[PDB]
């Protein structure tokens, strides 16, 4: 009957066979599988969020955003599997392409030459420009959210924490968070993803998290320990979790020249690094300026860097209402459904 995996149900229909456990992901575990229609081995993640308002929302986003987005650098949802009627749909399977590794695993045991870091950075920014032009924030860019196969192709994924941007809360892992957010505050500006990306670069250069820290004050001081104590217009700036009184009551910290920290890092990468990892969000480099930086000049081509066909535009409804929208949304992948 329905194929089991690690004693767990994984009924994905006769379109996918040969299931192989790979690990965890979120509302459920993740498996590999052979697609009997495309003759490839897609990745399928089981999600069971119908009885959670948080999960339900994080799901709907991930499904709605990806389904509407189409970019070489933004992972795509190849298919979705759920019961014929919302009455039985107790879990959803989102089938996507199977990339070999990801930036987290790679950067951990693997070493990347400068040429690879430059290409990786570019693919990352090229994709970020699309999302950012879509009037959207990823809000969670990190090594483990950048997939890749041996060809060096990179794709951004997981938009369950994304958010719609525009001019005018429980956090796991903080290593890639800008100072303004620090310790539950959720970002609202594209400039936040830049800091994250900046942080991701730093890691590809040393294979080690640029801003570790027992807690947010320890991380905070780790930053200044590198970037040196910021100005007063920089502190008084978007830094106000109140506990900022901490930084205010803190001696002078000097900056560590990037070149010293990264003795084997190219001069161009560092200059751009610096531009991204700036305390004052307002001064952080934007995605378009970055794509045009001397470092990424061998790949730079604004005509090959498409924007969202249309920006992205009500989402705190009760779970059973989200399930409803999660049903309607997944209705296109059902047989003969136009």
């Amino acid at each position: 009957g329905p194929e089991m995996v690690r004693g767990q149900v994984f009924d994905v229909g006769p379109r996918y066979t040969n299931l192989s456990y790979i690990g965890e992901g979120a509302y459920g575990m993740v498996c590999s599988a052979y697609d009997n229609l495309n003759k490839v081995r897609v990745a399928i993640k089981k999600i069971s969020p119908f009885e959670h308002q948080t999960y339900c929302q994080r799901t709907l986003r991930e499904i709605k955003i990806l389904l509407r987005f189409r970019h070489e650098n933004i992972i795509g949802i190849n298919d979705i599997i759920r019961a014929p009627t919302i009455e039985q749909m107790k879990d959803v399977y989102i089938v996507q392409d199977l990339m070999e590794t990801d930036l987290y695993k790679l950067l951990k045991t693997q070493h990347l030459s400068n040429d690879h870091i430059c290409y990786f950075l570019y693919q990352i920014l090229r994709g970020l420009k699309y999302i950012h032009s879509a009037n959207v924030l990823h809000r969670d860019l990190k090594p483990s959210n950048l997939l890749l196969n041996t060809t060096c192709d990179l794709k951004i994924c997981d938009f369950g924490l994304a958010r719609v941007a525009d001019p005018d809360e429980y956090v796991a892992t903080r290593w890639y968070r800008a100072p303004e957010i620090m310790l539950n505050s959720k970002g609202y500006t594209k400039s936040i993803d830049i800091w994250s990306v900046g942080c991701i670069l730093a890691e590809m250069l040393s294979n080690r998290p640029i801003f570790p820290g027992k807690h947010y004050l320890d991380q905070l001081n780790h930053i200044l320990g590198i970037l040196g104590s910021p100005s007063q217009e920089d502190l008084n700036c978007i830094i106000n979790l109140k506990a900022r009184n901490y930084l205010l009551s803190l001696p002078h910290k000097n900056k560590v020249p990037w070149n010293r920290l990264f003795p084997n890092a190219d001069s161009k990468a560092l200059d751009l690094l610096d531009k991204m990892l700036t305390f004052n969000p307002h001064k952080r480099i934007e995605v378009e300026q970055a794509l045009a930086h001397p470092y990424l000049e061998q790949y730079y081509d604004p005509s090959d860097e498409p924007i969202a066909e249309a920006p992205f535009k009500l989402d705190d409804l009760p779970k059973e209402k989200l399930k409803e929208l999660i049903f309607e949304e997944t209705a296109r992948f059902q047989p003969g459904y136009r």
Binding site: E72, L112, D115, T150, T151
Partner: peptide, 11 residues
Amino acid sequence: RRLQKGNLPVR
């Protein structure tokens, strides 16, 4: 041009 310039066998 096109998606090129890269190679790295991994997990």
